[PDB]
Design a protein around this ligand. Structure first.
Ligand code: NAG
Ligand code: NAG
Ligand code: NAG
Lengths: 49, 37
């Protein structure tokens, strides 16, 4: 006589993303020798990393 | 102006270089391949 199923799930699940960033040198933008003025604030993008 | 998304990669007419381009979701995706024929 059918009793029930069993929705097993050992060690839940694993979350995986690719290897570490590539072309994200945040240091030279944030530890830069060259900063900007407040009215002349710079604008540079970070992308694909 | 706006390229912050910059990217860097008798012989019988021995070549075939096709750059056929299609758009999905509005945002452009290049599709291409160079077949030496
Ligand atoms: C970049 O795109 C914006 C969006 O319309 C435009 O207003 C601006 O003029 C572009 N950049 C330059 C330097 O023209
Ligand atoms: C040709 O395509 C490859 C794709 O991996 C790219 O790396 C390369 O820069 C392209 N150009 C040349 C001249 O090889
Ligand atoms: C431009 O594209 C958008 C969505 O991709 C569409 O809604 C709009 O009608 C298009 N405009 C023209 C002039 O093709």
């Amino acid at each position: 006589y059918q009793t029930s199923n069993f929705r097993v799930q050992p060690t839940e699940s694993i979350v995986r993303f690719p290897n570490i960033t590539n072309l994200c040198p945040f240091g030279e933008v944030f530890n830069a020798t060259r900063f900007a003025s407040v009215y002349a604030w710079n604008r540079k993008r970070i992308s694909n990393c | 102006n706006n390229c912050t998304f910059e990217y860097v990669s008798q012989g019988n007419f021995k070549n075939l270089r096709e750059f056929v381009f299609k758009n999905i979701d509005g945002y452009f995706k290049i599709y291409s391949k160079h077949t030496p024929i």
